[PDB]
Write an enzyme that holds these catalytic residues in place. Structure first.
Site, PDB file in Angstrom:
ATOM      1  CG  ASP A   1      -2.117   1.013   1.036  1.00 14.53           C
ATOM      2  OD1 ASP A   1      -2.519   1.335  -0.097  1.00 14.53           O
ATOM      3  OD2 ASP A   1      -2.640   1.455   2.097  1.00 14.53           O
TER       4      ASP A   1
ATOM      5  CE  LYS B   1      -0.971   3.272  -4.037  1.00 13.99           C
ATOM      6  NZ  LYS B   1      -0.865   2.592  -2.761  1.00 13.99           N
TER       7      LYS B   1
ATOM      8  CG  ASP C   1      -5.433  -0.252  -1.412  1.00 13.50           C
ATOM      9  OD1 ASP C   1      -6.480  -0.668  -1.914  1.00 13.50           O
ATOM     10  OD2 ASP C   1      -5.383   0.860  -0.813  1.00 13.50           O
ATOM     11  CG  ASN C   2      -4.534   2.084  -3.725  1.00 18.59           C
ATOM     12  OD1 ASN C   2      -3.769   2.085  -2.746  1.00 18.59           O
ATOM     13  ND2 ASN C   2      -5.752   2.577  -3.667  1.00 18.59           N
TER      14      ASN C   2
ATOM     15  CD  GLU D   1      -8.471   4.727  -0.575  1.00 15.80           C
ATOM     16  OE1 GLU D   1      -8.687   3.720  -1.208  1.00 15.80           O
ATOM     17  OE2 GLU D   1      -7.331   5.211  -0.391  1.00 15.80           O
TER      18      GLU D   1
HETATM   19  O1  LIG Z   1      -0.418   7.161  -2.580  1.00 10.57           O
HETATM   20  C1  LIG Z   1      -1.019   6.224  -2.024  1.00 10.57           C
HETATM   21  N1  LIG Z   1      -0.424   5.488  -1.143  1.00 10.57           N
HETATM   22  C2  LIG Z   1       0.969   5.659  -0.698  1.00 10.57           C
HETATM   23  C3  LIG Z   1       1.113   6.799   0.340  1.00 10.57           C
HETATM   24  O2  LIG Z   1       0.375   6.470   1.546  1.00 10.57           O
HETATM   25  C4  LIG Z   1      -2.471   6.057  -2.254  1.00 10.57           C
HETATM   26  C5  LIG Z   1      -3.109   6.946  -3.150  1.00 10.57           C
HETATM   27  C6  LIG Z   1      -4.445   6.959  -3.412  1.00 10.57           C
HETATM   28  C7  LIG Z   1      -5.134   7.930  -4.276  1.00 10.57           C
HETATM   29  C8  LIG Z   1      -4.660   9.217  -4.343  1.00 10.57           C
HETATM   30  C9  LIG Z   1      -5.294  10.138  -5.190  1.00 10.57           C
HETATM   31  C10 LIG Z   1      -6.393   9.723  -5.939  1.00 10.57           C
HETATM   32  F1  LIG Z   1      -7.025  10.626  -6.710  1.00 10.57           F
HETATM   33  C11 LIG Z   1      -6.876   8.416  -5.851  1.00 10.57           C
HETATM   34  C12 LIG Z   1      -6.206   7.539  -5.058  1.00 10.57           C
HETATM   35  C13 LIG Z   1      -5.200   5.924  -2.790  1.00 10.57           C
HETATM   36  C14 LIG Z   1      -4.633   5.023  -1.934  1.00 10.57           C
HETATM   37  O3  LIG Z   1      -5.333   4.034  -1.329  1.00 10.57           O
HETATM   38  C15 LIG Z   1      -3.248   5.061  -1.690  1.00 10.57           C
HETATM   39  O4  LIG Z   1      -2.706   4.056  -0.933  1.00 10.57           O
HETATM   40 CL   LIG Z   2     -15.069   2.918   1.770  1.00 12.49          CL
HETATM   41 CL   LIG Z   3      -4.611   2.532   5.298  1.00  7.39          CL
HETATM   42 MG   LIG Z   4      -4.094   2.463  -0.673  1.00  9.29          MG
END
Ligand SMILES: O=C(NCCO)c1cc(-c2ccc(F)cc2)cc(O)c1O
Ligand SMILES: [Cl-]
Ligand SMILES: [Cl-]
Ligand SMILES: [Mg+2]
Ligand SMILES: [Cl-]
EC number: 2.1.1.6
Length: 214
Positions: free
Chosen positions: A140, A143, A168-169, A198
């Site tokens: 997580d 990316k 994740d993601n 989320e």
């Molecule tokens: O950068 C991420 N993680 C590493 C730093 O903690 C992260 C980003 C996003 C996200 C951001 C910007 C958007 F527009 C959409 C998603 C979502 C996440 O769950 C993530 O883990």
């Molecule tokens: Cl959610």
């Molecule tokens: Cl988290």
């Molecule tokens: Mg994430």
């Protein structure tokens, strides 16, 4: 002024019960739905995480990227007595939030924060942290680091037959190289769990990739 992460911690401290991980998760998700979005794994994907953790009952989990400790709370609350979580958080401010979140949740004895970059710390896990092999890894962090750090875990001998990678993601922001790699590799058995980003009506997902050995 205060950061968003400080505001989330404060909210938790003022709206959750000390020592009650479930209330902490609920407080975070309320804050993030009603007040300010934040990049915690969230409840939709969190429910999938919970189902994986329960299936595998890992004894030793490594998390790459902590943020505010949501996912560490989520996982650690479901670990069996004596099982452990190590979470690697390069951002010192995030690390400090995460520690305090865990302490409020009463999970501090289950979880260790490693401050620094995953790529620097992974090679130290055996000798400095007395790790043999990992049961599960939750990815997580940045990316673009999912793929290189997966390859590094393998190089360092930290993966065993059956080690569960959960990422994740994989759709948003997306991890295209990691996804292509694990889905094309005979050393991984992969499953995609479609969900939502989320706190948003936007599709995301988790990928599970079970290591099969060399
Ligand atoms: O950068 C991420 N993680 C590493 C730093 O903690 C992260 C980003 C996003 C996200 C951001 C910007 C958007 F527009 C959409 C998603 C979502 C996440 O769950 C993530 O883990
Ligand atoms: Cl959610
Ligand atoms: Cl988290
Ligand atoms: Mg994430
Ligand atoms: Cl990170």
């Amino acid at each position: 002024g205060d950061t968003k992460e400080q505001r989330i911690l404060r909210y938790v401290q003022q709206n959750a019960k000390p020592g009650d991980p479930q209330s902490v998760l609920e407080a975070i998700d309320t804050y993030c739905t009603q007040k300010e979005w934040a990049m915690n794994v969230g409840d939709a994907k969190g429910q999938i995480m919970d189902a994986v953790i329960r299936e595998y009952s890992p004894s030793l989990v490594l998390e790459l990227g902590a943020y505010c400790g949501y996912s560490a709370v989520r996982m650690a609350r479901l670990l069996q007595p004596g099982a452990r979580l190590l979470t690697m958080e390069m951002n010192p401010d995030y690390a400090a939030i995460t520690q305090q979140m865990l302490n409020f949740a009463g999970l501090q004895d289950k979880v260790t924060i490693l401050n620094g970059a995953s790529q620097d710390l992974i090679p130290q896990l055996k000798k400095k942290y007395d790790v043999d092999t990992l049961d599960m890894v939750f990815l997580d962090h940045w990316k673009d680091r999912y793929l290189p750090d997966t390859l590094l875990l393998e190089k360092c001998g930290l993966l065993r037959k059956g080690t569960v990678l959960l990422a994740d993601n994989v759709i948003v922001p997306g991890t295209p190289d990691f996804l292509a790699y694990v889905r094309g590799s005979s050393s991984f058995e992969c499953t995609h769990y479609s969900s939502y980003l989320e706190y948003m009506k936007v599709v995301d997902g988790l990928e599970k990739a079970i290591y099969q050995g060399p």
